[PDB]
Amino acid sequence: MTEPLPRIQHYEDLGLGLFIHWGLYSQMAVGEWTELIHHRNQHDYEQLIKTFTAAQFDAKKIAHAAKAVGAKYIVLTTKHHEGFFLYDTKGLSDFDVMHAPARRDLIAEFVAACREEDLLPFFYMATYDWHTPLYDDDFPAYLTYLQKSVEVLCRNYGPVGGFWFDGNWNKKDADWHLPELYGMIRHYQPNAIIVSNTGLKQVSDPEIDVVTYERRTPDEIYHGAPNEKYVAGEISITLNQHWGIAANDLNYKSPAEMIETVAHARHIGANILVNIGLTGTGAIPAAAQTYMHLLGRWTAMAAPVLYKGRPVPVTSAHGTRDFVLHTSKHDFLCILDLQVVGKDNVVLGGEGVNPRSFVGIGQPIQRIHWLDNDEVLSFTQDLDKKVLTVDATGYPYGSDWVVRIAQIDYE
Amino acid sequence: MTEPLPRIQHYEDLGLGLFIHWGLYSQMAVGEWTELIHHRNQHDYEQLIKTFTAAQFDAKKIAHAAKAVGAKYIVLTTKHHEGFFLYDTKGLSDFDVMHAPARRDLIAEFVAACREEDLLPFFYMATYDWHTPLYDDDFPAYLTYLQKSVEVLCRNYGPVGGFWFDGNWNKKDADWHLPELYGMIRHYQPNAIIVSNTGLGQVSDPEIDVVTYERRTPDEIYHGAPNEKYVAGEISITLNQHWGIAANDLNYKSPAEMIETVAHARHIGANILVNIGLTGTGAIPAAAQTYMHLLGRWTAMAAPVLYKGRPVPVTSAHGTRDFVLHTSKHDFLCILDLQVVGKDNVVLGGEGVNPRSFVGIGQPIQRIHWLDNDEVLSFTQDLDKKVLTVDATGYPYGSDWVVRIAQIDYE
Amino acid sequence: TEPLPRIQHYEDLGLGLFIHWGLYSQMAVGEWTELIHHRNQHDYEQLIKTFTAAQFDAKKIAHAAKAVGAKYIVLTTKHHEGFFLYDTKGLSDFDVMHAPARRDLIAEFVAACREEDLLPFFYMATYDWHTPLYDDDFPAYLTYLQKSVEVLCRNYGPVGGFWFDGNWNKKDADWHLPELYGMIRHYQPNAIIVSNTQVSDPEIDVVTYERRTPDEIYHGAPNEKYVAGEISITLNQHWGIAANDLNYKSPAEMIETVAHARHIGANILVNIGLTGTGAIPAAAQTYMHLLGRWTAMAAPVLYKGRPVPVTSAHGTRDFVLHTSKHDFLCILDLQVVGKDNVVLGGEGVNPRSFVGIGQPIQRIHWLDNDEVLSFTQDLDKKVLTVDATGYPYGSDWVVRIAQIDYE
Amino acid sequence: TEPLPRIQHYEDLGLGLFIHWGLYSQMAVGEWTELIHHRNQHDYEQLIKTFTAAQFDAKKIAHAAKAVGAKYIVLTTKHHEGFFLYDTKGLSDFDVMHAPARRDLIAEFVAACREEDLLPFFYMATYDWHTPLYDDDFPAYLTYLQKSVEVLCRNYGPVGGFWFDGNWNKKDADWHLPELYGMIRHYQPNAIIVSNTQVSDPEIDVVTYERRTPDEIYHGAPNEKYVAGEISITLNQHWGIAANDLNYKSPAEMIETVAHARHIGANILVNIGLTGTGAIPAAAQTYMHLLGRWTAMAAPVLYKGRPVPVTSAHGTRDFVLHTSKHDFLCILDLQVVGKDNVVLGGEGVNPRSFVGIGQPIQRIHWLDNDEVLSFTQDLDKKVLTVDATGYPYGSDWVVRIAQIDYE
Ligand SMILES: C[C@@H]1O[C@@H](Oc2ccc([N+](=O)[O-])cc2)[C@@H](O)[C@H](O)[C@@H]1O
Ligand SMILES: C[C@@H]1O[C@@H](Oc2ccc([N+](=O)[O-])cc2)[C@@H](O)[C@H](O)[C@@H]1O
Ligand SMILES: C[C@@H]1O[C@@H](Oc2ccc([N+](=O)[O-])cc2)[C@@H](O)[C@H](O)[C@@H]1O
Ligand SMILES: C[C@@H]1O[C@@H](Oc2ccc([N+](=O)[O-])cc2)[C@@H](O)[C@H](O)[C@@H]1O
Predict the structure, then answer these.
(1) Which residues neighbour A329 within 8 Å (Cβ) at sequence distance 6 or greater?
(2) In sequence order, what are the beta bridge partners of B333?
(3) Which chain B residue's Cα is nearest to A32?
(4) Is A132 inside a domain boundary?
(5) Which CATH number fits the domain that encloses residue D331?
(6) Which domain holds residue C41?
(7) Is residue C21 domain-shared with residue C106, that is, in the same domain?
(8) Would you call A287 and B294 a contact, using CB atoms and an 8 Å cutoff?
């Protein structure tokens, strides 16, 4: 029924963002929850402020890399559960980057770098806080502190792409005074996108614009009750098991799974964040760079559909995971489980005719071609039953796109 | 029945090797079979010799990286199907590195680098050759050329760890004169390990030491007919779908699958080779470096068992993929499918007691501990039925080893 | 909360037989045939003229239920087609008293159940294709539905329960459940009320669940009435008889589903569709006999066994049931034991572990043959490991059950 | 090489019934009971005294085979236990003439087969637990085995075939197959010789395969004799009757296995184990009735259909069979079609594709109900795509078959 507000339409066009976890935890490289889960002495853990130099943090390099990977926004942790702030809190707290050797407002560097690359800057903010005794001792006063921290971000950095709130789930029963928090954001940042990790329950507040979901969600996501405000959706993937850097977490997902995940998000009508954890001093680690390079080659190829493509009621035949995305000028077949083509005696698996069918395309087609190399595909249609069948040829030897995309040109 | 001859015994102790594909094909970055598969004009393809500078080939860097990853040998392509030689063929052919701008014997650099790191140098040699017309026109004379090219390798580089022969499968019916070829190797290099891609029912020549197998072979490999020479086994994994570099092959396996495959080779009684394809100019590509760093962290942890551990008739309980490796002083439980441990309300999957059982351990045990952190495991035994059950605790937050290894200390 | 007595008794029933029989049975193309095959209503309703019930024997049905180890039977008293298998005493002419059968089949059924010590349950469809009231005057339909249930509550003596199906057809409507269930409580205070569709009315006693539900079912909010649960399985794809539906489940899957219901804390109904004239088909008998062999073996745990917070090791589907005197290990994926050269899969030691048993054990034995199992315990971590020996050649129970005797 | 006439005839049989019946049947714990349960030989062999065959009716068995669509029957004439179901004419006292039955059961069987136009096949175990010759004087055992086969070749008229099982017990021994098979060829030149486990002797006509074999079977080296193939399925885990083996396969799996045999170019035997006294058990009758409905529907292709190099699209298990007049699409994983708001899974258009059909098609229709299917072709790439409509409510064939009529 209702259609997205302009700022939410713009959000859905972003498609892909980079999530960045960086805090004091990064110096230990054993996960962002280390303070709580490893039962550390608070006083000793908080001494990490003294070695927070940010000596290798280069916001320009990060924004350039985000642009190259095809991301259109970046979510940076401005304050995680540990409660340390990566920006100048202007007197709210001494546990911030201005009281660290770094002495730079990192958020200011980040916002300027994003603007130069035409990326939207988003601010992650943890609402469950392990630093301030207010959280357990005086929750109402905690709410004021949380709100003021958000307000500083709202008033000192120019227009903000969005806020990414995490952690109300810690006290599911409490009154978090969302009307006041969100209202303040609307007042200073009317165009900001408000994302919530615990947006659902029916949404947790009318001002929420986006709700997060499990990456494995099978079907098109929920957009709100009819006649209510349309709410977008977003999924997240981290490269291993942890969000902050974790040196001895070897359990990385394949680049292939990462590409399939990104494609999948688009298929169910969501944005996707791909997460990297910076080193203690703020560098992109070499492993993350590898994943970004590979994803970048895919998103460059997929550019005609990744941003504007939307789910459409077109299904694939029995036993395939193929799907279709719609833009106003074209449909795109996203085709999975292809193999590489050999020659003569050398059989790699992609060589035979490979009919892939779809149900729901009722218009006559002029031409279909692979985005990666412009090869024209042969096809048949039954317009009455709305059946399309293409011969989905395998990859040219030497290449393998994991999710291959064919563009349909209508008559 | 028979046991390995000493060179073979030493070979099985190597455990892990690095496979390196580098040739003229590397300059195109569309796979090592590009000349045949892409139906290239030979003269045009072979012009790549003129730009083969090897400007970024540093054998010391490669040997260092192999050492860091825990490899004990390196197999370098000395001549692939394209038929170009990476060494000085001393007049046998003009299609060699001495006729390229590089003007350096790359095999000589490689052998010196290996020796300084205590790695065995192995020479891959393609027996199916696309360059010399002898191959199709005058097979007997081809055999002489092949043999002479191996003789140069046998006589000019000091003691060689081994030869890795690939391509007799191209003419399954021909007489390859293996006794003469292998006999010549035994003359000059008595201690060299001879590996064959299609060396297997019956082995293709008595002089073969190692035969290759698919990585997914489920059970302990075949060692030869009972009264006959024991032959070792080896599996291979490439990181994507290609052996030479392939810039638009995004279909990389996960680091986790790589670790599981290394453990699996050891479990079935084989060595494992992890393949990297160099850039046109001979650099290790950034993606391969990422995989090497991850594997290196695992093999450093697994060092007590990776080299000397051998299969043993001890099975795991129903529904697990766990297995056991034996050394003279210890058994090691290799345990898969573990999760990370959270704390209190924060549940990551690994926190409950996790009984993993094995059948075939008959001796009383004194202590069991994880290699990664020395945590002591609780266990129970039934000595009559030869049952061991351990509580396989999950990973400490911030880490995940994919295959976790517990050392058993017997009473 | 603790379940009301009648609900405790319900959970002890364990297994029931579901019986689908109506005019649809004469065509043997599924119970929804009238709607799904778009039949002419007038022509379909003529099936009343050939409804003889010539082979319906309520005593044979009760016998079959007893033999299979069922403790109750749910009979379709009126399905969506809207034909009543009992005397509606003037409410409708579309009932068995206007059919050639001329027998109140519900009265036969109730008597047959009581003689075998089974509880009789009445299925009633609330979505009705026969009366124009359903679409054209919903409030008056509610009165008709309620009256049809009132007859069942007032003409047969004490009744085991009612099984309501079809409120799902109008999810938004006011079904006036307080009045319907209030009337039931008035005449039948002890009847179990089951509903196919937070619970929809305080008077509901049991709620249905999909047979594949993975985890222990929901019993109500704390401080509220405890509600039981039930799953259902039909042998092929249809509930009424369907002659050319060859897609029968394996007997093994049937046994696994019965065990699974107990594991999640639910009863289970196994459905049979009678022939046009009311006979149990031969195919259904075969399933019953196989099931009967299993439930006879499982008798010490099938009725009183309850879920307990004891899990099985990684990679097994084994589970535990608790009675007040014993725990029982329900062990899946066993193979048959050969001899020497003949290896059938079950011969090696087969350690199966469980977490959550904290008491020292004296003895463990298979229910099927009394073989004593070896085991080890770690009482601190609450680990039990048994060597689950494979089946004796010539037998295979699908779900094998070991009884634990505590010290 | 083209197959020999008798082998061509064999491949046209398609489906046979396998029947296990011996002394073991009286104990109902599997046909290997004597060896696997380590029984006292003397005590086990006393079962001859209660072998009455009181319920064996060869005419009923032949009728049931005909009804299920089988074209031949393989009967165990002597299993490992070594008891003979026929008159061995002095070769052994451990035969049916020395049992209360006092009837040549093989003679009854052959006559019953002939009246129903079925080929009679004789299973003979070559691994024998009765005669001490087997372990103590193997060469003399071969003479005894050969003589026992000679009786079957000389006293019963033309024999459809022999089904030899058990050379696998001594893989290395010289079984003197030239002499055994040569003797069969002399007396029964037209008999099919089947061997259960390069072929072991030129005279073998059929070789057995695992039922799960994925690809078209091996027919012999080129320039050599063509050898046919056969797979077998038993209903539970045992071949002889086993009362407490509840681990039955689904009827659906049975149908899929029959279709599968044809797909790989093999015949299929479906096994039943008789009761001690020679009756078909009720459970087996249920499976036979279900299979019979499928084979009656599949009759146009079940006998003459042959594999052909036409493959199905990615992600389906569909396949094609060729006769000289038609191709047939065998389509799996279909669902039932509901109506309007009632969704059963089969209602959307369901494009199923095949590669390898190069000729223009006039019409395609389902064998079960004659519904005409819509389709498209790309003749250059040899692609056919059909809309494989789901089952009419009330039916489910498991493997549905569409006949192609070419222009
Ligand atoms: C993007 C992710 O967002 C939250 O994820 C959570 C937060 C809370 C719970 N929780 O309370 O279970 C689980 C995941 C963070 O806690 C996490 O570190 C990461 O930043
Ligand atoms: C390690 C690998 O070894 C061989 O792999 C082959 C060779 C032949 C076939 N073949 O004939 O199918 C397949 C893979 C090489 O061809 C390949 O380039 C690589 O070096
Ligand atoms: C036991 C069964 O009870 C209902 O089954 C249903 C009812 C509703 C749904 N539903 O709403 O999804 C599914 C199955 C009936 O529709 C069916 O005919 C049979 O009697
Ligand atoms: C038809 C069947 O024939 C054999 O089945 C076998 C025999 C040998 C093997 N084998 O050696 O693997 C497998 C099944 C018999 O063992 C069985 O009793 C039955 O009669």
Answers:
(1) none
(2) B324, B406
(3) B398
(4) yes
(5) 2.60.40.1180
(6) 5-302
(7) yes
(8) yes
